[PDB]
């Protein structure tokens, strides 16, 4: 059967979920999907159903979105609920700390100062905020609003026990739960700091703009970063507390049915969903208010595929739970996320020699690797420009930088004796890149071949090619050389992957090659003993320059396509300082001083780059943007419109 059954927590839910299932049927064919109802105590309760394959969905708030996440339940967000309007759909709300400006304190100075809550108990007022400065508080932290107490000079904290702890209701005596409390709610909260009672209030990211029409006087605030730093009102994107999802339907992580539940709630709201002027109206009920959905949604968005709940909650919001659940409290060892055998090998080696400095963690791909470096399973790990981009996407920022010798040159290199070819029209030919979304194979030729044909559907630019990454059966995967699987793949099992492998896909197959300045003379020559490159003569290849014109290989300095940002660590703001000290003094130890080491490796270019010699700091280039520069990241913004890369449409759907 295609019946998903869906979890109600009251009477009013189960009766509405009834007359849901009613209606469905009238609406969907025979071959759709159906509706089912379970009817348990708790939303707890729905949790362990759906985990014991009793029930398929239910939509919870963020903190049983984390429960519901946590062994032995296992499940993970697979439909949002979004709010606003459908043109412009909210999904997250942001809980933020507000102060006056000029009051000269950030967010590692709060001790002393006098807080507004909205209430106890609540997300953005209280869970979130004493969550984050959990282990700032004062021992014994155990009950929380004693800690509290003794950490905020004197507060509004609504609904806080005032009899034992006094300071919490110095700035609204009583700490009234009602509206009739002044300083009580989402709104009282930041009336609290705009009355000059507290230094800060905990609120959320739309409380600012719904208490100040003016601009003018939106001007006098301002957001403490977690960094420890200060922004304006309206980047409360980059200066927040926690990203928090309102309202998620969560499903088993393994056994579904996350397609059957998008395709019944995506067919709910075409015909009950906002406006719809049905008998039934999936978002309201006569039965009560916020059954099933809350009645303020407008719809339903999916949640991408790559997401867990870990990733959708943000690492934000599950270290401020953490904090509250577990209650633990101790510069750490430096975690690298390596890809393979050979890189955890490697690193396996440098942690031992490291004496604990260093540990290492696996995952199978490199998104894996970024995504676990998000959640804080990993901590640092070095990438291509092209990966840079997705790391910063989705929050990750440079740290240090791989120096060779301003970065390598991106070069197209072609066979002499085929002297036709110009960079002026490749349309047609052939084209052999190291992998799609990668510096000197993708971004860089493929973003200035979007200048002038003005699409990124580069399979029907030209004939046929080898770009790792591709769908399977496009054009651009042809020429690879990878046996079943592995053909077409991002990774050393296709012989045609990275600079070395689009420089052999040149010579067997292709036309023109996307590499950097150094792969050719290393590949030629005899130096590389492999039967496919050890008769190649170097000058047997030249470069398109923009001009039009061709120059020899080792003339890359006046015929490149662009400079190549650097690859680089990269790392959590929260680990930034930490990574950018041990790794500037394991460099000291290890770098360019069985022989050799940490810029050395026993295949080819393992954790970093072998012509690495150093590694180099940022200044103010730690982030993405100002590392990668403007012209490059305008460049994949052009190219993301035919991009794959699941994980960046995961960080997409968190912040667009
Ligand atoms: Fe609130
Ligand atoms: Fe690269």
Redesign the pocket.
Same mark, same amino acid.
């Given at each position: 059967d295609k019946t998903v059954r869906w979890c109600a927590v009251s009477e009013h839910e189960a009766t509405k979920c009834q007359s849901f299932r009613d209606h469905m049927k009238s609406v969907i064919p025979s071959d759709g999907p159906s509706v089912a109802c379970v009817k348990k105590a708790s939303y707890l309760d729905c949790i362990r159903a759906i985990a014991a394959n009793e029930a398929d969905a239910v939509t919870l708030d963020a903190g049983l979105v984390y429960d519901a996440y946590l062994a032995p339940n296992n499940l993970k967000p697979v439909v949002a609920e979004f709010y606003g309007s459908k043109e412009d759909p909210q999904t997250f709300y942001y809980a933020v700390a507000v102060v006056k400006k000029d009051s000269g304190f950030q967010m590692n100075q709060l001790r002393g100062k006098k807080s507004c809550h909205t209430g106890l108990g609540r997300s953005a007022g209280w869970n979130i905020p004493i969550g984050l400065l959990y282990c700032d508080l004062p021992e014994p932290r155990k009950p929380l609003e004693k800690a509290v107490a003794n950490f905020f000079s004197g507060s509004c904290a609504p609904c806080a026990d005032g009899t034992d702890f006094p300071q919490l209701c110095q700035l609204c005596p009583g700490c009234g739960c009602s509206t009739l409390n002044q300083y009580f709610g989402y709104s009282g909260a930041f009336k609290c700091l705009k009355d000059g009672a507290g230094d800060v209030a905990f609120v959320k990211h739309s409380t600012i703009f719904e208490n100040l029409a003016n601009k003018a006087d939106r001007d006098q605030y301002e957001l403490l970063c977690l960094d420890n730093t200060r922004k304006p009102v309206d980047e409360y994107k980059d200066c927040h507390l926690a990203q928090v999802p309102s309202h998620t339907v969560v499903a088993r992580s393994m056994g579904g049915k996350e397609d059957l539940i998008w395709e019944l709630l995506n067919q709910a709201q075409e015909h009950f969903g906002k406006d719809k002027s049905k008998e039934f109206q999936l978002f309201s009920s006569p039965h009560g208010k916020d059954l099933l959905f809350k009645d303020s949604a407008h719809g339903f968005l999916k949640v991408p595929p790559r997401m867990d709940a870990k990733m959708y909650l943000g690492y934000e919001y599950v270290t401020a739970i953490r904090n509250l659940r577990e209650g633990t409290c101790p510069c750490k060892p430096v975690k690298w996320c390596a890809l393979s055998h050979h890189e955890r090998l490697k690193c396996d080696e440098w942690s031992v020699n490291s004496v604990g400095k260093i540990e290492c963690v696996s995952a199978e791909t490199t998104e894996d690797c970024i995504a676990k470096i998000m959640n804080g399973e990993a901590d640092a790990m070095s990438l291509? $420009? $092209?990966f840079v981009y997705i790391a910063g996407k989705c929050g990750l920022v440079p740290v240090l930088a791989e120096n060779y010798n301003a970065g !390598?040159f991106a070069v197209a290199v072609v066979k002499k004796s085929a002297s036709d070819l110009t960079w002026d029209n490749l349309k047609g030919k052939k084209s052999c890149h &190291?992998a799609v979304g990668? &510096?000197? $194979?993708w971004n860089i030729p493929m973003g200035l071949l979007y200048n002038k044909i003005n699409h990124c559907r580069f399979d029907e630019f030209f004939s046929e090619g080898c770009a790792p990454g591709s769908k399977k059966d496009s054009s651009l995967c042809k020429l690879c050389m990878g046996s079943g699987l592995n053909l077409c793949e991002p990774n050393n099992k296709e012989g045609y992957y990275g !600079?070395t492998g689009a420089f052999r896909c040149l010579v067997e197959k292709g036309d023109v090659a996307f590499v950097?300045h150094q792969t050719v003379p290393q590949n030629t020559g005899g130096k590389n003993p492999d039967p496919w490159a050890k008769n190649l003569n170097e000058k047997d290849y030249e470069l398109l320059c923009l001009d039009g014109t061709r120059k020899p290989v080792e003339e890359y300095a006046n015929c490149h396509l662009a400079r190549?940002p650097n690859?680089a660590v990269v790392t959590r703001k929260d680990k930034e300082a930490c990574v950018h000290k041990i790794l500037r003094q394991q460099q000291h130890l290890f770098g360019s001083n069985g022989n050799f080491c940490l810029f050395r490796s026993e295949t080819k270019d393992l954790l970093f780059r072998d012509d690495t010699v150093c590694l180099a700091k940022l200044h103010d280039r730690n982030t993405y943007e100002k590392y990668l520069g403007e012209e490059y990241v305008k460049a994949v913004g052009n190219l993301r419109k035919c991009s794959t890369s699941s994980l960046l449409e995961a960080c997409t759907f968190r912040r667009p």
């Open positions: 291509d $420009g $092209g !390598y &190291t990668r &510096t000197a $194979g !600079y950097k190549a690859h």
